[PDB]
Design a protein around this motif. Structure first.
Motif, PDB file in Angstrom:
ATOM      1  N   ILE A  23     -19.232   0.119  34.644  1.00  0.00           N
ATOM      2  CA  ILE A  23     -19.975   1.346  34.367  1.00  0.00           C
ATOM      3  C   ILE A  23     -19.064   2.519  34.018  1.00  0.00           C
ATOM      4  O   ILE A  23     -19.544   3.569  33.579  1.00  0.00           O
ATOM      5  N   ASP A  24     -17.749   2.363  34.167  1.00  0.00           N
ATOM      6  CA  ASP A  24     -16.831   3.315  33.562  1.00  0.00           C
ATOM      7  C   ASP A  24     -16.837   3.211  32.041  1.00  0.00           C
ATOM      8  O   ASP A  24     -16.515   4.187  31.354  1.00  0.00           O
ATOM      9  N   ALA A  33     -20.087   7.835  37.939  1.00  0.00           N
ATOM     10  CA  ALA A  33     -19.402   7.675  36.673  1.00  0.00           C
ATOM     11  C   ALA A  33     -19.811   8.748  35.685  1.00  0.00           C
ATOM     12  O   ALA A  33     -19.190   8.851  34.621  1.00  0.00           O
ATOM     13  N   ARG A  34     -20.833   9.542  36.028  1.00  0.00           N
ATOM     14  CA  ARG A  34     -21.362  10.645  35.221  1.00  0.00           C
ATOM     15  C   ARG A  34     -21.793  10.179  33.837  1.00  0.00           C
ATOM     16  O   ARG A  34     -21.540  10.836  32.826  1.00  0.00           O
ATOM     17  N   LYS A  35     -22.436   9.026  33.799  1.00  0.00           N
ATOM     18  CA  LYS A  35     -23.142   8.421  32.690  1.00  0.00           C
ATOM     19  C   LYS A  35     -24.630   8.682  32.844  1.00  0.00           C
ATOM     20  O   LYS A  35     -25.146   8.641  33.963  1.00  0.00           O
TER      21      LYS A  35
END
Lengths: 342, 305
Positions: free
Chosen positions: B188-189, B223-225
């Motif tokens: 997810i990075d 991850a700030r997605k």
């Protein structure tokens, strides 16, 4: 006057020492007017420049009548230091070279006929510039080159000090694909000095500015490298200003941050707040009938700039030095085991 | 003469099409209840449909989409009971409204895509979780738009749903891998956008679907997605929990009993989690793109009195 930070006396703006008390070397006056007027430097360029002008000032001895060479040279060279102290406040690559130099002055013995003084100061300071700078940087290249895959990008900042050679090495001497993004800041446009050299050598440079810092990181991007001015005892980095914004943005967008540093550049002191120990840098440079003239004579206006501020050690993924990689919280073990003892 | 309770009307047409889902099947059964059983009096009609909704919840309790459908049917008969036709026309007026859901909610899923295609931009690696068929109804029109993307599908342990997507849009012709559900944090990075699909929306904006959408949500936050969720407008439900724990399946999510001889040991923790309103950032319905405070207002206005 609400924070009163503009009256921080860590730099003194007094100039024009006319006193003929000492024999000030004309080359060192060239070096101070080359530093303070138009800044052409980083930190280890200042270290190599200071070291290879102290080379010349020890090569031109001119010893006095009754004083032995072991009993004059530290005071003479400290008065040589004082002009650079007036010019620009000193790096740790300044300080950890000059205190080593004074310790090596101290172990000379009163039997030198001022002919082998060259052979144990010139050759020894050349061994210093070899060992603690240049081949240490060669170890930086040979240690950091294994941590870059092909066809990736690099986001440096400002003028690099060591990792210009790293980008040139991984671009040309190892031929793996790489796309360097250089970003710098007002007023010392020193990322352009990296951009000219790297693109002249023929690598995919893409210059930017720090105001547009968002749209760099929205591309395919990883491996932010950072040149260091010093690394504190805690793990706080210390470098040219505007480093920490892309540091926190880079850690925020979960892509790694590295710092290419060497063991000459670690420091004994300690701070955690950014505007505590810092350099004010000549506020006339932030103007270029101009846009505004005279922040003075207008009541209630000021112009401030900062050269140095701190990234917190949560952000740096990996400080790399010539002994090896390390987490930034573990820098006192190389303060105590390797700095000075090596 | 059918009685519409369990399987004499409801479970029959679930075998007619494996494209219709649970809540609109509940809507279809509840409208065909009073489409025939309308004994010319406004009293026992509502008693019949309330009894039918409660026995249909009593059939399968752990499929909260059913509660969403069986309660928006009550909102339908309440607002169609409003406009006050004195019940003289409403015996015909309500039933001629009637099948407007099976002419409306059946064709809502491409109306989802007509407003959600303009989210997946060029070269976006996409993470989906569980067989949420509104997400595939978006992705089908996205791939028919000839836009370039890649997809990553998680496992859906123990509910098996993650194996269906890799045998669904592969044959449509999309480069897709099947990640295992525990490997989210290492990938997810790199994932640009992450979609899920809800089996319910609480009174603040919540995802009440599957085992671990709270885990992939809190991975998306650190991850700030952006964490989007594709749903549609028959998925609103009154059930507003406060913990990460909903109504139970049959006991608590932390069992500590004794396996007798060789009984099953995988499904021993929870199976339907909850996501708070912070972790979702935009949800897609028939009502447009919808921020979670807007879905809170939309589920706060039609449920008060």
């Amino acid at each position: 006057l609400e924070q009163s930070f503009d009256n921080s006396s860590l730099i003194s703006s007094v100039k024009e020492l006319l006193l003929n008390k000492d024999l000030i070397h004309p080359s060192i006056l060239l070096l101070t007017s080359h530093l303070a007027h138009y800044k052409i430097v980083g930190s280890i360029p200042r270290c190599i420049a200071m070291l290879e002008v102290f080379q010349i000032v020890i090569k031109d001895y001119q010893t006095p009548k009754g004083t032995t060479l072991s009993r004059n040279l530290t005071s003479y060279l400290s008065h040589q230091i004082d002009l650079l102290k007036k010019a620009r406040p000193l790096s740790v690559t300044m300080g950890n070279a000059i205190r080593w130099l004074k310790q090596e002055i101290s172990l000379i013995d009163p039997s030198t006929p001022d002919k082998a003084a060259k052979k144990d100061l010139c050759e020894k300071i050349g061994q210093f510039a070899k060992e603690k700078i240049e081949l240490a940087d060669q170890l930086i290249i040979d240690n950091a080159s294994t941590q870059i895959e092909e066809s990736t990008t690099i986001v440096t900042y400002g003028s690099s000090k060591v990792l210009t050679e790293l980008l040139l090495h991984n671009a040309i001497s190892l031929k793996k694909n790489i796309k360097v993004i250089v970003v710098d800041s007002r007023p010392l446009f020193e990322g352009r000095k990296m951009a000219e050299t790297l693109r002249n050598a023929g690598v995919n440079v893409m210059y930017a500015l720090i105001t547009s810092l968002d749209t760099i990181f929205n591309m395919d991007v990883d491996y932010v490298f950072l040149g260091a001015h010093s690394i504190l005892s805690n793990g706080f980095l210390y470098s040219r200003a505007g480093t920490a914004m892309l540091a926190m943005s880079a850690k925020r967008r979960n892509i790694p941050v590295l710092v290419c540093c060497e063991s000459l550049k670690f420091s004994q002191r300690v701070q955690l707040d950014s505007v505590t120990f810092n350099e004010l840098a000549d506020p006339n440079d932030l103007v270029n009938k101009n846009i505004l003239d005279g922040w003075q004579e207008l009541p209630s206006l000021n112009i401030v700039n900062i050269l140095y501020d701190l990234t917190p050690p949560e952000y740096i993924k990996k400080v790399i030095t010539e002994f090896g990689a390390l987490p930034p919280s573990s820098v006192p073990v190389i303060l105590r085991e390797y700095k000075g003892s090596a | 003469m059918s009685e519409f309770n369990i399987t004499e009307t409801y479970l029959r047409f679930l075998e007619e099409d494996t494209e219709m889902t649970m809540p609109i099947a509940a809507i279809e059964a509840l409208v065909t209840l009073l489409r025939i059983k309308t004994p010319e009096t406004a009293a026992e009609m509502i008693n019949t449909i309330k009894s039918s909704t409660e026995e249909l919840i009593k059939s399968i309790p752990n499929s909260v989409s059913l509660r969403a459908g069986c309660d928006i049917f009550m909102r339908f008969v309440l607002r169609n009971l409003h406009l006050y036709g004195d019940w003289e026309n409403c015996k015909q007026h309500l039933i001629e409204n009637g099948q407007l859901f099976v002419s409306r909610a059946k064709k809502s899923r491409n109306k989802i895509a007509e407003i959600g295609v303009d989210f997946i931009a060029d070269d976006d690696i996409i993470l989906v979780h569980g067989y949420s068929r509104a997400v595939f109804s978006l992705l089908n029109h996205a791939a028919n738009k000839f836009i370039r993307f890649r997809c990553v599908v998680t496992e859906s342990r123990p509910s098996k749903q993650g194996n269906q997507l890799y045998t669904l849009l592969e044959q449509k012709g999309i480069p897709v891998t099947l990640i295992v559900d525990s490997a989210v944090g290492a990938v997810i990075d790199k994932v640009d956008k992450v979609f899920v699909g809800a089996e319910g929306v609480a009174e603040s904006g919540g995802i009440i679907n599957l085992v671990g959408t709270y885990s992939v949500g809190v991975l998306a936050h650190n991850a700030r997605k952006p964490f989007y969720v594709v749903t549609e407008s028959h998925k609103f439900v009154r059930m507003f929990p406060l913990s990460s724990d909903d109504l139970p399946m049959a006991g608590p999510p932390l069992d500590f009993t004794r396996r007798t001889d060789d009984l099953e040991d995988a499904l021993r923790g929870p199976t339907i989690d909850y996501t708070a309103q912070e972790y979702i950032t935009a949800l897609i319905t028939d009502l447009g793109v919808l921020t979670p405070s807007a879905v809170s207002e939309e589920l706060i206005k039609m449920w008060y009195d």
